[PDB]
C-alpha cells in the first residue's frame, strides 16, 4: 500500500476553524466549511493553515449546496503570495460528523488540490472523547467511492509550540 498513513494538524488550524464557526454565529444543525493548507506530498499529510469559505446548504435537501469557486481561487492566490510552501490540500468542516453531501463536495475540491483531497472535520463543539479532529480521504471500494479514516495527531512547529504554551500559562499555574 502507498496510501497516506496519517495526518498532523497545527493548533492554529483548530483555533481558526473554531473562530470561523463563532464569528459567523453558526447555529445548529448548520456547519461552517473552509479550505485547509499544508503539505500532502508524503505518507504524512501535514495540515498547517486554513481559510474560511462562503458556503450555503439546503436543510430540506442534502443534494443542494453552494460553494463559491471564485472565492477559493481568489483567496488561494493571496495565500500563495504570502507563503507558497502551504499548498491547497483539502477542506474542512465543523461536522461534528460526516454528512451525506461530503463525497460530492469533496469531488469539487478535487479540482483544486494536487493530492487526493483531505477532508478534515474539526468538531468545534468539542464533545468527543479524544481529539476534536477526524481526517478522511476518498477511495474506491468493492465499486463505489467511500471515505477512508486516517489517524490524526496535533503537532506544532516551534513557533506555535511557544505560542500555545504562552497562551495556556495561567491555566498551567492553576
Amino acid at each position: 500500500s502507498l496510501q497516506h498513513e496519517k495526518v498532523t494538524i497545527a493548533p492554529l488550524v483548530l483555533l481558526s476553524a473554531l473562530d470561523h464557526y463563532e464569528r459567523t454565529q453558526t447555529k445548529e444543525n448548520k456547519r461552517c466549511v473552509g479550505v485547509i493548507l499544508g503539505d500532502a506530498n508524503s505518507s504524512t499529510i501535514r495540515v498547517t493553515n486554513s481559510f474560511a469559505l462562503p458556503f450555503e446548504e439546503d436543510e430540506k435537501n442534502s443534494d443542494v449546496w453552494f460553494l463559491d469557486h471564485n472565492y477559493i481561487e481568489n483567496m488561494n492566490e493571496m495565500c500563495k503570495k504570502i507563503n507558497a510552501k502551504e499548498k491547497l490540500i483539502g477542506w474542512y468542516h465543523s461536522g461534528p460528523k460526516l454528512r451525506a453531501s461530503d463525497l460530492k463536495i469533496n469531488e469539487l475540491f478535487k479540482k483544486y488540490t494536487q493530492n487526493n483531497p483531505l477532508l478534515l472535520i474539526v468538531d468545534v463543539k468539542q464533545q468527543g472523547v479524544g481529539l476534536p479532529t477526524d481526517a478522511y480521504v476518498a477511495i474506491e471500494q468493492v465499486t463505489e467511492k467511500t471515505f477512508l479514516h486516517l489517524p490524526c495527531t496535533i503537532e506544532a512547529e516551534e513557533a506555535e509550540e511557544i505560542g500555545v504554551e504562552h497562551l495556556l500559562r495561567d491555566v498551567l499555574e492553576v
Binding site: L12, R23, A52, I154
Partner: protein, 166 residues
C-alpha cells in the same frame, strides 16, 4: 494604563508569519476593535506580501488589502484595522526611524492605531519576545503598552489538545 489584548489566532499567526519570513522582516495588519481609550482588542491579523521596498508604508499593498478585507467580510470577519505588526528577526522589539514614520501614517488614518513588534529569533519556550507601541502625543517619540491575551473557554480546551496526555 493602556492594554492591547491579543487573541489566540492573532498571536499564533504573528509568530508563524515572523518565523516563516526569517531572515527577512515581515509585516501585516491587525484587526479588532477599540474598546475604550485604554483598550485595544486584536482579534485577528493578516500577512502582507514581501515587497522590495522592505517594511514601510510603501509595503502596504492597497489592492491586496482591499481584496483581503472584502473576502474576510464575506466570511464573518468585519473588524477595523486597529494597527499593524512587523518582525525584527534577532534584534528585539522597538521602532526604527522608518517604523516611526510608518506608525505615523497609521496614526493619521486612526489616532488609536497600535504598532506591534515581534522577534521570531529570540522568541523561545517560554519567552515570547513581543511589544506594542504608540507614538507620544527632548521628549521621546513613542511608548510601550501592556500586552495581555484573551482566550475563550472553548479556545482553552482546543489548545489543550497539543499535549493532550499532558
Amino acid at each position: 494604563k493602556e492594554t492591547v489584548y491579543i487573541s489566540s489566532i492573532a498571536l499564533l499567526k504573528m509568530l508563524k508569519h515572523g518565523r516563516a519570513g526569517v531572515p527577512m522582516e515581515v509585516m501585516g495588519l491587525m484587526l479588532g476593535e477599540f474598546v475604550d481609550d485604554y483598550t485595544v482588542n486584536v482579534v485577528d491579523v493578516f500577512a502582507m506580501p514581501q515587497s522590495g521596498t522592505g517594511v514601510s508604508v510603501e509595503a502596504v499593498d492597497d489592492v491586496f488589502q482591499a481584496k483581503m478585507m472584502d473576502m474576510l467580510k464575506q466570511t464573518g470577519r468585519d473588524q477595523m484595522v486597529v494597527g499593524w505588526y512587523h518582525s525584527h528577526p534577532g534584534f528585539g522589539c522597538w521602532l526604527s526611524s522608518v517604523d516611526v514614520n510608518t506608525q505615523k501614517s497609521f496614526e493619521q488614518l486612526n489616532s488609536r492605531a497600535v504598532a506591534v513588534v515581534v522577534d521570531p529569533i529570540q522568541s523561545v519556550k517560554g519567552k515570547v519576545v513581543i511589544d506594542a507601541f504608540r507614538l507620544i502625543d527632548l521628549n521621546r517619540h513613542y511608548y510601550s503598552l501592556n500586552i495581555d491575551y484573551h482566550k475563550t473557554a472553548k479556545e482553552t480546551k482546543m489548545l489543550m489538545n497539543l499535549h493532550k496526555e499532558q
